[PDB]
Every structure is written in structure tokens, then in C-alpha cells.
């Protein structure tokens, strides 16, 4: 299963054991990895005209920055800052899915979970940000109590 | 044909509420700081550059405050505590006078001359702490 | 936009406005001129009309209006060969 996106196809019990493969290509190998973008800048300095392929490298950089920061912000509002599997205090509402653990973790892929739960994630994200905000308020005045 | 369902908290909805119950809605404004209406579901138009300039500005301002959180001891958090003691020449108000009575944007217009002095002391006690946490790991 | 733009009522806040120092007006004024000049730039330059225009008012129950505010004017235009002239009228 090792290799980028190689666990697509396996069930999500075994596809979640190798999450390091995805969170290294999407954190390291995006902006830090390439130094050849500044080898094409001097070749754009040789020609004195702004070309079509110089505009498309703006739009592929600003899409690359925003795609990186809009997944680290969302992991920053929650308590899951620098980790890959984190737990929350949000109880699972059975009207999101009534489906058992053995059907989910052992007979369903992640790509079949995208096409089931996607209408509900905007509601789920509200309840993770709200419970994280209630937690840090509670551990501040507890801290100030002693 | 649509219709308004149940309502929840919304963006800036706790502005002018108070100071202690507007800090229970910190994630609502912190969610709307990076992605706006610019992201939806042929080249070099006047409205094309003005949309692209709004996307480069929105990253520069976000990374500005996100840098400043990590220089402090407070990364990935919403409420953090420091070791800098509060100085009454910055503001002398009581504890039940800024909480439960004051709102933000009234406290903002009060200490906005002193924030550059406050920001320097948070950064200085973070250098002094991280050297000490290094020098505690030599035993 | 898949939702139409919305409006959240903010409670207990006051705010000073000033319609004579609002910069949304000066930003909108530079944009309406910018969009105006973008469109006229690929259109046709019309320097072959700087010539003389020899003409007499129009020819003709009766029409009896617009006789002193409108006239056909004939002139030597250019053709698509830059060697020939064409005798061309216009109101």
C-alpha cells in the first residue's frame, strides 16, 4: 500500500494505518521541495516579454499556497495541530450515519465515505470548533483558580 | 425556492455583545479569515487582476498574525496565557469592569497605543523561556 | 455565488459613517473608466474622416422637420487598396 494514494481501494481500517504517506506529500513535498521554480525565473528574465506560461505559474502558486493553508488553519481551530489522528469530545449523532463499525471500518473505503457524509461535514465542523472553544475557556479559569 | 431553517452563530455576531461572552465565539471569526467568497464551485481582464490581488492580500494578512502567534508561545491555540505581568499604566480598570461590562471595540480604542509595547514583552519572555527549557535539559 | 449575498444584523453596535469621504466612490469611478477604455481599444481607429465634408442640407404630408439639424455629407473615403478613392455620402 506504500506509495502516494496507494491505499485508495483498500478498506478504511487498513487505509488509515499508512497516513504518513499522504501527510508528507501534502506538507513537505509542495513548497519546500521544489527549487526549480527559481530556475525558470531567470529564463523568464532572458526574454523581455511576459509569456502565457508565466501567468499560469502565478495561478499554480497561489492555488498551491491556499490549498496548504486552508487545511492547516482548519486543523488549528481544532485541537489537532501537528498530528494525524486526533480524538474529540463530539458525540457521534446517529442521524449522520446509523451504520455499524464493522461495516464502516471493514467493508467501506474512504472514497465511499466521501460520497456518504459530505452533506453533513459543514454541520460536523461547527461542533468541533464550538467544543474546542468551550474547552480552552474552561481550562483557563480552572488554571486561574488555584 | 428556499427557506430559513434553524440559526446558529454568525460572522461578527458578538461584536458589541460584551467581553466575556464574545470570547465564546472566537472560532466564528477565525474561520472567515483565509477563504472568502472568492472561491466558487479569459485572461487579464480588469476584474481578473482585481480578483487575483484580493487572493494575494488575504494570504499576506493571514500569515502576518499567524507568524506572530508562533513567535509567542501560542501556536494552534485560541486562548493562551503568558508570564508577562499586567502593568496598570497600560490600563487601570477592574476585573469586573472590563469583563461583564466592557465590549471589544471599546477595549480596542483604549489600549491601541500600548500594543507595540505589550507585543515586545511577550516575545522577550519567550526567548527567555526557551533558553531555560534548553538549559533545563542539561542534567 | 451559490447562495445569494446575505446580511447579518449586528446588535448593540454604533458606527460613524461619512458619505463624502467614502473611498468606495473613488474606487468605483476609476473602475468604470477602466472598463470603458478596455472596450474601445480593439475597435477601429477612424482617422480617414479628418477630411473636408462638402454638402448641402437634405433633399426633402411634408417632412418639414429636421431640415436645420441634419444633412447628408459626401466625401472622398479610402478603399481597401490605398490607391483608390471612393465618393461616399453620409448623414
Amino acid at each position: 500500500l506504500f506509495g502516494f494514494l496507494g491505499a485508495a481501494g483498500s478498506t478504511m481500517g487498513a487505509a488509515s494505518l499508512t497516513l504518513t504517506v499522504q501527510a508528507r506529500q501534502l506538507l513537505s513535498g509542495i513548497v519546500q521541495q521544489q527549487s526549480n521554480l527559481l530556475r525558470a525565473i531567470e529564463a523568464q528574465q532572458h526574454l523581455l516579454r511576459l509569456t502565457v506560461w508565466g501567468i499560469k505559474q502565478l495561478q499554480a502558486r497561489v492555488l498551491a499556497v491556499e490549498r496548504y493553508l486552508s487545511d492547516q488553519q482548519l486543523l488549528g481551530i481544532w485541537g489537532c495541530s501537528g498530528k494525524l489522528i486526533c480524538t474529540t469530545n463530539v458525540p457521534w449523532n446517529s442521524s449522520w450515519s446509523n451504520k455499524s463499525q464493522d461495516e464502516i471500518w471493514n467493508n467501506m473505503t474512504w472514497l465511499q465515505w466521501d460520497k456518504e457524509i459530505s452533506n453533513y461535514t459543514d454541520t460536523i465542523y461547527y461542533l468541533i470548533e464550538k467544543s474546542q472553544n468551550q474547552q480552552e475557556v474552561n481550562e483557563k479559569d480552572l488554571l486561574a483558580l488555584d | 425556492a428556499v427557506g430559513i431553517g434553524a440559526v446558529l452563530f454568525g460572522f461578527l455576531g458578538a461584536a458589541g455583545s460584551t467581553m466575556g461572552a464574545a470570547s465564546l465565539t472566537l472560532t466564528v471569526q477565525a474561520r472567515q479569515l483565509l477563504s472568502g467568497i472568492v472561491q466558487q464551485q479569459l485572461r487579464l481582464t480588469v476584474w481578473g487582476i482585481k480578483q487575483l490581488q484580493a487572493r494575494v492580500l488575504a494570504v499576506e494578512r493571514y500569515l502576518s498574525d499567524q507568524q506572530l502567534l508562533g513567535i509567542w508561545g501560542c501556536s494552534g491555540k485560541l486562548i493562551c496565557t503568558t508570564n508577562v505581568p499586567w502593568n496598570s499604566s497600560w490600563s487601570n480598570k477592574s476585573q469586573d469592569e472590563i469583563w461583564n461590562n466592557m465590549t471589544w471595540l471599546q477595549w480596542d480604542k483604549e489600549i491601541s497605543n500600548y500594543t507595540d509595547t505589550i507585543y515586545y514583552l511577550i516575545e522577550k519572555s519567550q526567548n527567555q523561556q526557551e533558553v531555560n527549557e534548553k538549559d533545563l535539559l542539561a542534567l | 455565488t451559490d447562495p445569494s449575498p446575505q446580511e447579518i444584523h449586528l446588535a448593540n453596535v454604533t458606527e460613524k459613517f461619512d458619505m463624502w469621504k467614502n473611498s468606495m466612490v473613488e474606487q468605483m469611478h476609476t473602475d468604470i473608466i477602466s472598463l470603458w477604455d478596455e472596450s474601445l481599444k480593439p475597435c477601429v481607429k477612424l482617422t480617414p474622416l479628418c477630411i473636408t465634408l462638402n454638402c448641402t442640407n437634405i433633399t426633402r404630408n411634408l417632412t418639414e422637420e429636421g431640415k436645420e439639424e441634419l444633412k447628408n455629407c459626401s466625401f472622398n473615403a479610402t478603399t481597401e487598396l490605398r490607391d483608390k478613392i471612393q465618393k461616399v455620402h453620409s448623414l
Partner: antibody
Amino acid sequence: VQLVESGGGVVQPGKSVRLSCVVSDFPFSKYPMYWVRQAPGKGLEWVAAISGDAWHVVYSNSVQGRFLVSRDNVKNTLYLEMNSLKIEDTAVYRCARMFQESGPPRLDRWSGRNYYYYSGMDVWGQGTTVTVSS
Amino acid sequence: IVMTQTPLSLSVTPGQPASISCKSSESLRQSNGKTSLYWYRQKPGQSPQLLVFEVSNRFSGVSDRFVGSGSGTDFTLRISRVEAEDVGFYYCMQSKDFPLTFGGGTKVDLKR
């Protein structure tokens, strides 16, 4: 599919009725339902609309504050109440179903609201009538 | 939103195609990009019946003689080769905003 109605009859002005519209072999918690109204020798009107969530209901302007729409997702039924009946309501009341299921409420993050989605028709009911008389 | 139709009644010949148009005041293009125009059919003493549930696309179980067209506010419904199953009442319905109004209604007849 089959859409069955009942509960219609003859009353006085200033009374209360309870129409009903039982469905056959739906999920029925996915489909929001309607109520149209056809006077004799007239065109169709619109009366009310409940969602599959059974949370957000809307009424027409002329019938506001007088009617009451509910549903029971266990029994697969519609429950149209009426109150303070006028004279001009002598017509035929058909329940109806949207041609596709509206999904869940869609939370808008910027204002914190939930939104329901409404659309057209598949299946009008049989068509029951209420005639008010003296 | 109001609705008006032309005409109020047709008098046609079997085998000859005809058309019925609806007119809306406000444009019915939703924020989805898809419109909200609905074409119905009520036989006399009968339940109504959907025919075309957009500008264009046809209901599952309706013959291909009924074609729909239009955009904005101008819309039509062009019956191809009017037959004995194509008489009665034809309606327009919007679903852009509440209240969900119906059109006026035509009465398609032949010449006995």
C-alpha cells in the same frame, strides 16, 4: 407510485377539519410534500409546504395563521389542520410530492443559518374536497 | 411573481403542430444556474400530470412530441403533431420563490 387521500367532507363556517394523505412505498423522510387547491372552474393555487425534516413549513398569504401542517415519518402520513373556515374555500385539496428529494439542510458558515430547498412536482394525490355550507 | 400565457385556447388540426408560450415578469434563473419552469397537464376530471420539468428535459414516461425551450422570461412549449391524447389544460408553474404560483391555463380543443 400510489398517493392516497381521505378526510374530506362538508362542514359549516367556523369549523375545524383534518385532511389526510397516506403514501405507499417511499422513504418519505427525504421528500418534502405540498398542498395545492383547485376551485371549481378555476385554475390551481398553492396552499402549504412542509419539509422532510418536518421543521420548516410555509403557507400562502391568504391562508396565513389559519392552517397547520404536520407529518409523521413513522406512520407515513400528512396531517392538514384547518381553522376558522371561510366560504371561499370550497375546492379540491391535493397533496403532492417533489420530483427529487431535497437533501439535508445546508449550513451556511458566514451567517450560521440552515437552508432548505424546494422544487416542483411528481405525483398529485387522488383529490379530496371540502365544501362549506349553511 | 405573476404569470401570463398566450393564448387562452387553441383550435388546431390533428397532425398539425402547434405551440403554447408562457411569460414571466421576473427572470426565473436560480442561483444553481438551472431555471424553475414546469409544464403540466390536467385532463378534465383528472389529476394533473408533469410533462417538462425544466426548460428542456422531459418527464420519464412522456412521448418525445413535447419539446421545451426558452431562457430568461420568454418560454414556449411546441407540441409536435397534435393527437387525441393532447387535449385539456396546460399550466405553467414557477418555483423560484414562495408562493409557488401557477399560470393562467390554456384549453386545447379541436374543431368538431
